[PDB]
Amino acid sequence: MLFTFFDPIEYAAKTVNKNAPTIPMTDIFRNYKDYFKRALAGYRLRTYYIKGSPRPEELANAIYGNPQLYWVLLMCNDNYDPYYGWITSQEAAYQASIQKYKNVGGDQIVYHVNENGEKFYNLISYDDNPYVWYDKGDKARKYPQYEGALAAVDTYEAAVLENEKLRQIKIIAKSDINSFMNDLIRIMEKSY
Amino acid sequence: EIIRGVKGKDLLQNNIDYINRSRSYYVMKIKSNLPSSRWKSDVIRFVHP
Amino acid sequence: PVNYQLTRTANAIPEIFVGGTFAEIKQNLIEWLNGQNEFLDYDFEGSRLNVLCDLLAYNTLYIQQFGNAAVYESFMRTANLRSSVVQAAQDNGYLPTSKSAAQTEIMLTCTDALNRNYITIPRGTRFLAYAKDTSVNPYNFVSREDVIAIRDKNNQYFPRLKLAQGRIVRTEIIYDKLTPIIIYDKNIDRNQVKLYVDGAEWINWTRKSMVHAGSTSTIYYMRETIDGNTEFYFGEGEISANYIGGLKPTQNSTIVIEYISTNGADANGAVGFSYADTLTNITVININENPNDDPDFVGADGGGDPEDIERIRELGTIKRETQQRCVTATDYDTFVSERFGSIIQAVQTFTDSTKPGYAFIAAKPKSGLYLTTVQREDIKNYLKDYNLAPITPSIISPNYLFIKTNLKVTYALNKLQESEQWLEGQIIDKIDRYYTEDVEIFNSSFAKSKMLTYVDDADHSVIGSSATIQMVREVQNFYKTPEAGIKYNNQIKDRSMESNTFSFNSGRKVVNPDTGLEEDVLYDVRIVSTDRDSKGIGKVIIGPFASGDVTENENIQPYTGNDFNKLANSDGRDKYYVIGEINYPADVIYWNIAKINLTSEKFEVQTIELYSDPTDDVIFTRDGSLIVFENDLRPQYLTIDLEPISQ
Amino acid sequence: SFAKSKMLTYVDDADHSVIGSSATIQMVREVQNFYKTPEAGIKYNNQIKDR
């Protein structure tokens, strides 16, 4: 109930189908994310939990909090997508890989990753040829890039590499959360 | 008196009387094709002082 | 149309969003659930595997609103719920004037005992005003700016100033840079604010009174943060300005906000003011002239209350057509608007071709009729700063066509409660609400049938109604009329266009009883437009005359006949003089009294009504001439009869 | 009772734009057996104008 907390309002929807019926609705339009942001001032230095488990979307009932709050973890990372925002089961990304490229191209090679991490993007070697890489166009060659050598990350690895970097989050330490949430209300009752 | 003039524009017969006809003064001539009733609403509103 | 390629569409929410009626959702899910995929192996039951389908359909129809509403208030034109509307209108550079305060200019006649020259009159100078509804209670007034006075001849001052409604409040705050400084109170016209930062000035950004070309940093910002409570904040600047941006405070400062309490729109009454002045030797001599400017005065103006949703939108999108500058006729209409608005109901700016420069602006205040002055000069300046430099804006005000009703509502005595009076006034605003909604604006006509359906909507007991009607249009200079001017735009119904009152002077002396003599100021006159004729013709006459004063010569020989040209009722001795044209089919009036060659000094005050009755029931409009009825200012023509019925 | 203004709200609601309407009403009671009148009668209330 740390969401809600106000009233249904009424959602007119009159801009579409005039004389539309008013439907009481949980109030999601407050700009909550700001309240959290301003209230958080002074409770900062929330440490870096590092995650470490493909914890399903709610670890709130394990780590800090635990009234199955399922957020204050969200507002941490400013998550735009509550589904693919958090890290996922290792297979999920793989599963997510297919549906991404299933329409076009099939499995591919997104970039070739020089050591020291210099990405390349549509740069292509020729085996049984010079050892130097070329772009996927200007097949006349004549315009080589990156005389060195590196190793492609194909596709699956990338999605893994991309979602796995998404595990770090703030906490509020399981200490402040009570004192914190005790503030976070006060700002809310303040403005009305 | 003018000496060392220049020739700007024709407008056929040259007379101070004809060159005025009815003097336009500061009016602006949109002078492009069209029936003039299609754009006239839209020149005002989005364009023109 | 003709070519089918022109169909397109207006703003259209695509079929992708829309949203469920329920059972259609049940239909689409069943086809997706049972078909194309499973061909049920379900282990629930014959009925259960069926029943459980809509159990998750209520989950859809729910999530198809709760989460699907966001895209409705994400955009502007399709959104509802103010908050989203407003908050999405600031990135268009608008803000919706949360409230407003009344404003006037009064000239104080006061004086000081020290006789010192250049007396000042500082910011607040608390006044109080009844803003009359009857008498009891004042509200408040504060001048809020400066001015100065000058001593001349006898020792007196004329520190004429302008004043806002509310009081003031100042809350100083320490800037934490983590702390979104705000206000919380339901008030504080964003038009008038100061907000010093510890030195002075800070002229902000969103609203300029000067624009102070260059000047770089020191700006601040005012938006919404929904909730009704205004947000202040500062730019990204550094000032170690760095390059471009707001100066920003430095990590700790005294930020002094001062606003106006703005009691509300209830204060429109104005009229009598009192000094309530304690400063120094200034005596506050009173003789306070609320309207020392010009013609008829309504009292104060403005007062606001927050703008309606249907207002913002129209002004919210159009300000993308502009960028903080007015080059276009439709721009002035948006710049004379909630920025300077609440003092102007409608505009329709236009440019006259014969006279270059000089952008003309018609405006009707919510107070009615004329803007007086210094509320005009105010609209002047706020434009010319954002204007197109060489051309000067000017406020002509529109050409008003009022209408004279004389209607009777014929209620029933049985079902009333407050009886007369309260219903006498309850029928007023309903009529007034009809104007404000439909025909208040330009280019719109009104139908007396539509006025009567708001009349019959008074409460209940009123059953039926009816009215005669006359279109009243009052000339300004009179004595002449302009060239090819003074036109109704409607068919005039000949044997109409009836006079007003007038009067005469001179006529030798004609001494009376009691005191010495008089000027023979009685024996008035008045005009009648006579008949139609072969095509337009019709002439017109100046009015009743006895004998003596005129120049007859060969060009006058006063007469129209004992035919039409109906007679004024007095001794008056007929002999109506022919004056002007009045072509009926294309509506035109022409007078020029100089035809009969009298002296303008023989006439009393100008600005006389004429008011012909219309032919057709519906009254049209054109050429920037409004039809708007405002009662409170001029009662002169409204007459209604409550004649009752006993069952 | 028949009100002129109460019908003019329905004729106004016919289609989107009628831009209002007006009318003039003639009261007429047809009476069989002319030449006599029923010794008292043809009484229609709401006194009519002259002639």
How does DSSP assign D28-43, residue by residue? ----SSTTT--SS---
* C510: Cα separation from own chain's centroid: 49
CB D5, CB C410: distance < 8 Å: no
Which of C328, C360, C386, C388 to mutate: most B Cβ within 10 Å?
Answer: C328
Distance CA A7, CA C405 (A): 49
Closest CA to C464 of D3, A174, B27: D3
For C443, residues 6+ apart whose C-beta sits below 8 A from its C-beta are: C348, C621, C622
From the CB coordinates, do chains B and D have 3 or more pairs under 8 Å?
Answer: no
Nearest residue of B to residue C334, measured between CA atoms: B45
The answer for C611, left when phi > 0, alpha when psi is -120 to 50, beta otherwise, is: left
Residue C448 near chain D (CB below 8 Å): yes
Q: Which of C330, C388, C391 sits opposite B45 (nearest CB)?
A: C330
Measured CA distances, C7 to C1, C10, D16 (Å): 7, 10, 22
- Looking up tokens 């020089």 gives A114
Residues of C whose CB is below 8 A from D7: none
Measured CA distances, D23 to A63, C456, C618, C619 (Å): 80, 17, 12, 15
Closest CA to C304 of C267, C269, C276, C332: C267
CATH number at residue C345: 3.30.300.200
Please give the single-letter amino acid code of residue C177. K
Checking A22-29 for CB contacts under 8 A at 24+ apart, the result is A23/C65, A25/C65, A25/C66, A25/C69, A26/C66, A28/C66, A28/C69, A28/C70, A29/C73, A29/C81, A29/C83, A29/C84
- Tokens representing C128 are 């109080």
Q: Which residues of C touch B (CB under 8 A)?
A: 321, 327-330, 351, 353, 356, 388, 391
Helix (H) or strand (E) holding C395: strand C393-395
Residues within 8 A of D (CB atoms), C 271-330 only: none
Deposited resolution, Å: 3.8
Task: Say if the Cβ atoms of C445 and D1 lie within 8 Å.
Answer: no
DSSP letters for chain A: --S--S----B--TTSSSSPPPB------S-HHHHHHHHTTTS---------S---S--TTTSS--SS---SSHHHHT-S-TTTSS---HHHHHHHHHHHHTTTT-S------BTTTB--SSEE--TTS-S-BEESS-TT----B-SS-----TTHHHHHHHHHTT------TTTHHHHHHHHHHHHHHH--
* C9: Cα separation from own chain's centroid: 34
- Tokens representing A192 are 């009305």
The subunits that touch chain B, with at least 3 C-beta pairs less than 8 Å apart, are C
Distance CA C452, CA D20 (A): 10
Residues within 8 A of D (CB atoms), C 341-400 only: none
Distance CA A30, CA A28 (A): 6
DSSP letters for C535-557: SS----B-----SSSS--TTT--
Q: Which residue segment(s) compose the domain that C338 sits in?
A: 309-395
Task: Say if the Cβ atoms of C69 and A191 lie within 8 Å.
Answer: no
β-sheet bridge partners, residue C467? C407
CA pseudo-torsion sign C194, C197, C200, C206: negative
Q: Which of C452, C463, C466 sits opposite D1 (nearest CB)?
A: C463
What 3-state class would DSSP assign to C108? coil
β-sheet bridge partners, residue C258? C170
Q: Which of A29, A41, A190 sits opposite C81 (nearest CB)?
A: A29
Residue C97 Cα, gap to closest chain A Cα (Å)? 19
Residue B49 near chain C (CB below 8 Å): yes
Residues of C whose CB is below 8 A from A26: 66
Distance CA B5, CA A7 (A): 82
Nearest residue of B to residue C391, measured between CA atoms: B49
Closest CA to A17 of C66, C25, C19, D14: C19
Residues of C whose CB is below 8 A from B26: 356
CB environment C136-174: b (16+ within 10 A), e (fewer): eebbbbbbbeebebebeeeebbbbbbebbbbbbeeeeee
Task: Say if the Cβ atoms of C69 and A11 lie within 8 Å.
Answer: yes
- Looking up tokens 């009648």 gives C528
- Tokens representing C148 are 């100065």
